[PDB]
Design a protein around this ligand. Structure first.
Ligand SMILES: C=CCO[C@@]1(C(=O)O)O[C@H]([C@H](O)CO)[C@H](O)[C@H](O)[C@@H]1O
Ligand SMILES: [Mg+2]
Ligand SMILES: [Zn+2]
Lengths: 219, 215
């Protein structure tokens, strides 16, 4: 019956700044026998398993940088990270072990950085895909910041929005950028009717869209 | 070195059963409680159950979410932890992790496995099509199209190309997933040297090495 709740849901901090986040328990976690609060913090970096940081509310696991400090008692806990590094990008979970175990809902820490324009590349469909009746055109928009970006696809100069799938990465753990992939899928018969295939990226870094294109006649 | 390695995840139909295992090494297994925790994609960690240590009779406990439906056991001869899941439902689709738990002294989960992914679905296993993406620096890629279930793995040059890789989360469409991966190297080095994407889809035992050929 122990409810764990974390605050904020998410936030972003620039490298070198302080981060503080909260963990509340619906009942005290202070065990009276041992005089310790049974509250641990775990860090879960994008694509990895959770890693133990802090336990008994304030004991920092060996190998954990001293920039991480757990504090609090009873029903209220805090994790502070001083001089945050790009590598600290993660979801942070608190977890009680007073009565069985229960995790909080997590705090997503993002890293704020300087605005950066994407590096855009476009790719025609492979001969092997075309042999099978389909045609996917791929556009990568790499290493940009902030995450918000617009991509339009133009075929023979006319926008086309149907048949498009977009995917963003998690933020990068070393450069704090995002990347995005955009895939336009057409029939082979439709693909063979048009010449110019264009991916256009509009990001806050420039008023000019970044335009990458290929012509089928030049393939 | 402490090792925990989960196995047993994959695709199972609603109403079916599945048993996971967790192979451990590098510590006195019988001294430790062991927990299972799951995580639906994009969502929070959820504790499922533990099995206690020898000192406590290897007795078990469960979250109310799975009590009656999931069973935890352990093989103390081989230091292997198990999770039996029955009457699976859509909401059981998740990465399952085993974690080393309490030793009588410390309140902490010191170590976690890599996780194994369970998908509960009526859809069929479909292997991916893998396509090469050829055009100072050069960006190359692979398109990994039309597979089910998750996951797939993508490496470049058997993993020796790791920096400047971006592998994009799969997107689900018409009951199939598609993902892509980019790699960026110096143009003096490709096509001068070979660049290959290595794709695996455990569900269909698919292994693919796609060399990125110019022109
Ligand atoms: C005498 C053993 C009790 O230990 C357990 C247990 O097994 O229930 O319970 C402890 C409680 O503080 C009650 O003492 C902790 O939750 C501990 O982690 C473990 O789950
Ligand atoms: Mg048209
Ligand atoms: Zn009991």
């Amino acid at each position: 019956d122990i409810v764990m709740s974390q605050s904020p849901s998410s936030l972003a901090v620039s490298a070198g700044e302080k981060v503080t986040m909260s963990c509340k328990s619906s009942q005290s976690l202070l065990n009276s026998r041992t005089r310790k609060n049974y509250l641990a913090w775990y860090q879960q970096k994008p694509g990895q398993s959770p890693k133990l940081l802090i336990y008994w509310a304030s004991t920092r696991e060996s190998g954990v940088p001293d920039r991480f400090t757990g504090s609090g008692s009873g029903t209220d806990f805090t994790l502070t990270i001083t001089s945050v590094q790009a590598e600290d990008l993660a979801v942070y979970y608190c977890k009680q072990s007073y009565n069985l175990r229960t995790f909080g809902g997590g705090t997503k820490l993002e890293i704020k950085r300087a605005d950066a324009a994407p590096t855009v590349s476009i790719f025609p469909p492979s001969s092997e895909q075309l042999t099978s009746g389909g045609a996917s055109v791929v556009c990568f928009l790499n290493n940009f910041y902030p995450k918000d970006i617009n991509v339009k696809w133009k075929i023979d100069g006319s926008e086309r929005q149907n048949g498009v799938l977009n995917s963003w990465t998690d933020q990068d753990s070393k450069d704090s950028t995002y990347s995005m992939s955009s895939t336009l899928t057409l029939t082979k018969d439709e693909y063979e009717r048009h010449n110019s295939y264009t991916c256009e990226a509009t990001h806050k870094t420039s008023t000019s869209p970044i335009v990458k294109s290929f012509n089928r006649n030049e393939c | 070195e402490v090792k925990l390695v989960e196995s047993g995840g994959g695709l199972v139909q609603s109403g079916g059963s599945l048993r996971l295992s967790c192979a451990t090494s590098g510590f006195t297994f019988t001294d430790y409680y062991m927990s299972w925790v799951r995580q639906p994609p994009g969502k929070a960690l959820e504790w499922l159950g533990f099995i206690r240590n020898k000192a406590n009779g290897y007795t078990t406990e469960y979250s109310p979410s799975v009590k009656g439906r999931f069973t935890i056991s352990r093989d103390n001869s081989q230091s292997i932890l198990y999770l039996q899941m029955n009457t699976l439902r859509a909401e059981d689709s998740a990465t399952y992790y085993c974690a080393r738990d309490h030793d009588g002294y410390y309140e902490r989960f010191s170590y976690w496995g890599q996780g194994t992914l369970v998908t509960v679905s009526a859809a069929k296993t479909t292997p991916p099509s893998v396509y090469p993406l050829a055009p100072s620096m050069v960006t190359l890629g692979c398109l990994v199209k039309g597979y089910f279930p998750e996951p797939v793995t993508v490496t470049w040059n058997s993993g020796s190309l790791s920096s400047g890789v971006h592998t994009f989360p799969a997107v689900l469409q018409s009951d199939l997933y598609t993902l892509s991966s980019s790699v960026t190297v110096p143009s003096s080095t490709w096509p001068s040297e070979t660049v290959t994407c290595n794709v695996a889809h455990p569900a269909s035992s698919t292994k693919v090495d796609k060399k990125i050929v110019p022109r």
